[PDB]
């Protein structure tokens, strides 16, 4: 095994990749990492968190300063052939003296029956009720107490659900070709609101990375076809804002050419079935993409105050090719546009569409159904008006959109979202702003939604992993854990704003989430919730420590990972958008270094909860111990405990 002096025999923490861990005092000492006779030593220096290079011993062996007292985790990686090596630091509460516990199991594992921690892969025989178990290098002190016959993951249930919820165009850049659709540009700046080139391909490269994590459901953002151009972006038009996160919709019938083809789209479902992964498409009814120049010049819609010469001399041959001159912003282009011009406008959407205080429009209301939310042009779900297609689809060839008698808008739209699930075998949606459209809406794209998918399923039997109904989980903005009208007009279960917050206030002591765990399991007993750490419109969460994983994985209910959690994806350049960091690029790079054993990490306590549906769905003890913090779960015949040793420290 691998060893240095002064440390801990190392214990291996993910294929090829080995750990130990201690609480160093300030100072200096060498540096070797020993395997049998094979002496190795860093061959470039020594920091911390940089995969060091190393070379077999010779000489006087390298100095390691310790500037700081902490718990420190010496990592060796052997997956390149020539061992590479890494250092970190770690810097009312149960304490933990760092040695093994001795657990009352009487009441939940049969005596003489055998108990694995699943982190560990340790097994221990029940003698007396009693268990003893050393928590392993990098399980922060968590036993993950299951019974040893446990072998794989137990049957997908929404209510035990493990949802990765991606930015598809801040994920993998399959292929580069398709990132610079429709004249789209980059910045040059720092990229804050630009297609940065993700899309499905690349996407689908990492259903064994996701599979890995214990994920059962991809939530992936709108691949439906967006507004071509740009608008100002945040406050002070800082940067270009693009439809980068799907949320921008033009044209609900077509893929984005961003995200690729229709047969990319087919790989990435059946793939992601083939692993037990369940599909959700990210979807909006409530609004369109604001008018853009790309797509006002490409459609033939609105107006310019730019008449004569003064129009190709001042936005150009391709207008979205505008970019703002000195003591302008990329909001500056607005100026140019007339938003009053009736007849201009009414060839975009047309009036039987959209309310926006533009030209001849409907005007928006003063409540949340009926409002323009942030100027976003509001479909008329609501409308009994037969419309026939949207105006400027006239000026749209490429559509697969078609007129269908006697339809309204909202028929239209949960027809276009229908298909998708009918073609492809969609297993569900999270729903945006959902309380800005009327719950009759969300029942009729279930309805349709449901009988689309039976269909598919009905058709596809091979293809098909159950006969479960289509799932639709919606975004309520603060919605908490409360069976909601919500839940009586086509959703499944809400996202929960609530959970963020209290896993803050445990941040610093996994014990403090103790109430909120029994009070999500005991309610949601009759109901589901999908909570979250991180999220497009909230912020990262990355002050759990090492932490995170246990923090939302054995969270009752479903539980969403915003892509990144699980590698600590740094909050990105943001400009005068507060929310644009939350977007920012995965971090591939850290994923294969410095961020490695936290992805290791994620992938053992997510595959502990695929393992046990008492974990999403069981009712809650919380045990009474003289040390440490533990509970068990119980749903029908799966039961597990956790243990947590508490603060090393
Ligand atoms: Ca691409
Ligand atoms: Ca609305």
């Known amino acids: 095994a691998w060893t240095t002096t002064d440390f801990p025999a190392f214990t291996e923490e993910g294929t090829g990749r080995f750990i130990s861990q201690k609480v160093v005092e300030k100072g200096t000492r060498p540096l070797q990492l020993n395997f049998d006779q094979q002496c190795w030593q860093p061959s470039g220096g020594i920091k911390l968190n940089q995969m060091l290079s190393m070379e077999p011993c010779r000489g006087t062996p390298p100095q390691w300063r ?83 016959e446990t072998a794989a993951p137990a049957p997908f249930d929404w209510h035990n659900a493990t949802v990765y919820f991606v930015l598809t165009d801040r994920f993998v850049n399959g292929n580069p070709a398709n990132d610079n659709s429709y004249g789209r540009h980059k910045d040059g700046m720092q990229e804050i609101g630009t297609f940065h080139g993700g899309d499905l391909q690349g996407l689908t490269s990492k259903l064994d990375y996701l599979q890995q994590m214990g994920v059962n459901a991809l939530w992936i953002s709108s691949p439906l076809e967006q507004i071509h151009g740009w608008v100002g972006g945040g406050t002070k038009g ?108 009414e060839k975009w959407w047309g009036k039987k569409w959209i309310r926006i205080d533009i030209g001849d429009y409907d005007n928006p209301g003063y409540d949340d159904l009926t409002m323009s939310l942030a100027f976003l042009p509001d479909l008329k779900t609501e409308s009994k008006e037969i419309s026939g297609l949207p105006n400027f689809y006239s000026h749209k060839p490429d559509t697969a959109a078609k007129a269908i008698p006697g339809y309204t808008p909202r028929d239209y739209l949960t027809h276009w979202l229908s298909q998708w699930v009918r073609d492809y075998g969609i297993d569900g949606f999270r729903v945006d702003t959902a309380k800005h459209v009327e719950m009759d809406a969300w029942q009729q794209l279930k309805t349709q939604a449901t009988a689309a998918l039976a269909e598919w399923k009905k058709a596809n039997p091979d293809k098909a992993l159950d006969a479960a109904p289509f799932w639709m989980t919606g975004e309520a903005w603060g919605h908490g854990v409360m069976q909601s009208d919500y839940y009586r007009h086509g959703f499944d279960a809400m996202i929960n704003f609530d959970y963020q917050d ?148």
């Open 238 to 345: 800082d940067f270009p804002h693009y439809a980068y996160h799907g949320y921008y919709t033009q044209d609900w019938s077509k893929l984005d050419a961003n995200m690729g083809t229709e047969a990319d789209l087919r790989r990435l479902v059946d793939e992601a079935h083939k692993r037990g992964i369940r599909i959700l498409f990210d979807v909006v009814m409530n609004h369109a993409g604001y008018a853009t120049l790309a797509d006002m010049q490409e459609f033939q819609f609105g107006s310019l105050y730019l008449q004569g010469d003064e129009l190709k001399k001042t936005l150009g041959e391709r207008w979205t090719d505008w970019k703002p001159g000195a003591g302008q912003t990329w909001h500056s282009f607005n100026d140019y546009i007339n938003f009053s011009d009736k007849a201009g406008w």
């Open 66 to 148: 310790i500037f700081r007292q902490g718990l420190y985790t010496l990592e060796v990686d052997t997956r390149s052939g020539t061992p590479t090596m890494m250092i970190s630091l770690e810097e009312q509460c149960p304490k933990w003296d760092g040695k093994p516990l001795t657990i009352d199991v009487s009441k939940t594992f049969a005596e003489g029956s055998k108990v694995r921690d699943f982190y560990s892969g340790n097994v221990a025989t029940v003698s007396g009720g009693k268990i003893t178990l050393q928590p392993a290098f990098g399980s922060n002190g968590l036993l993950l107490l299951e019974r040893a």
């Open 502 to 649: 209290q896993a803050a206030k445990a941040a610093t002591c996994m014990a403090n989430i103790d109430l909120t765990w029994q009070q999500m399991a005991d309610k949601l007993q009759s109901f589901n919730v999908l909570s979250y750490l991180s999220s497009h419109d909230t912020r990262l969460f990355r002050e759990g420590g090492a932490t995170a994983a246990e923090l939302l994985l054995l969270a009752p209910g479903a539980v969403q990972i915003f892509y990144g959690d699980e590698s600590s994806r740094p909050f990105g350049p943001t400009g005068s958008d507060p929310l644009q960091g939350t977007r920012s690029e995965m971090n591939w790079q850290d994923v294969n270094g410095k961020a490695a054993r936290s992805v290791t990490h994620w992938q053992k306590i997510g595959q502990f909860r695929a393992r046990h549906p008492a974990i999403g769905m069981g009712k809650q003890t919380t045990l009474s111990m003289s040390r440490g913090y533990g509970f068990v779960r119980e749903s029908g015949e799966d039961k597990v405990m956790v243990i947590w040793a508490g603060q090393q420290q």
